[PDB]
Write a structure and sequence with these properties.
57% helix; 0% strand; elongated; Bromodomain adjacent to zinc finger domain protein 2B
């Protein structure tokens, strides 16, 4: 509350560490469905169904331009990529399996780096 604070966590490396995670996600072999925005002219249903599209290139540009105020807003956008994927794709499809695998990969790196 006012004049009552928990001890200050060192957050000075967060930006760099989120960038490293994102690099590791970008270079994973199953990242291909997520690298670029879904083409809303060429994929029927996507525009109407997915209210907040997100992809790795869009996260990278937000990260590089100071549009994440803290590491929780960064994690929210990553998870949104996988939540969108589950909304639109069957579990038993290449893209559906890609999203489950990438989500797992991300969640481990996140825990290991920050928890």
């Amino acid at each position: 509350s006012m004049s009552v604070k928990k001890p200050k966590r060192d957050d000075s490396k967060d930006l760099a560490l989120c960038s490293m995670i994102l690099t590791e996600m970008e270079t994973h072999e199953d990242a291909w469905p997520f690298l670029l925005p879904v083409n809303l002219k060429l994929v029927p249903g996507y525009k109407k169904v997915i209210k907040k599209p997100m992809d790795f290139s869009t996260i990278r540009e937000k990260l590089s331009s100071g549009q994440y105020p803290n590491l929780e807003t960064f994690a929210l956008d990553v998870r949104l990529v996988f939540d969108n994927c589950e909304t639109f794709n069957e579990d038993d499809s290449d893209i559906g399996r890609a999203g489950h695998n990438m989500r797992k990969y991300f969640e481990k790196k996140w825990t290991d780096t920050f928890k």
